[PDB]
Amino acid sequence: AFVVTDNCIKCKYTDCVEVCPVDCFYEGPNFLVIHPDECIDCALCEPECGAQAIFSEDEVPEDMQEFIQLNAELAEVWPNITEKKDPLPDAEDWDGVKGKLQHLER
Ligand code: SF4
Numbered sequence: 001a002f003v004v005t006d007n008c009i010k011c012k013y014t015d016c017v018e019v020c021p022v023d024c025f026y027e028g029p030n031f032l033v034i035h036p037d038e039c040i041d042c043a044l045c046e047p048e049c050g051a052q053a054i055f056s057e058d059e060v061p062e063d064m065q066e067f068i069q070l071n072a073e074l075a076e077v078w079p080n081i082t083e084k085k086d087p088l089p090d091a092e093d094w095d096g097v098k099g100k101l102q103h104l105e106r
């Protein structure tokens, strides 16, 4: 599985969904996750994310490991998203800001 990690939060560009051949992205108010059972590890979404938030599960930084099960948990409860939409307002201001997990909205 690939995993969405902290910098997606409050940015949510959604550039990643357009290349996902299996549509396994799931949508929160201010964050996206990857459903690890449906994801086929094609890696195509990784270079599409301007916030560089997406990692292969085995390359998730040590300080963001919590995001692995968080993706799995929220992918079960959020609605599927298969089409690009406008990034969140002020996404540029939050791109690069650390510890945005504290801002995650369910
Ligand atoms: S790695 Fe491929 S299948 Fe998995 S979330 Fe990214 S685009 Fe979709």
Ligand code: F3S
Binding pocket: 004, 007, 008, 009, 011, 012, 013, 014, 015, 016, 017, 031, 032, 048, 049, 050, 051, 052, 053, 054
């Ligand atoms: S910011 Fe989030 S919505 Fe997709 S393009 Fe990057 S993982």
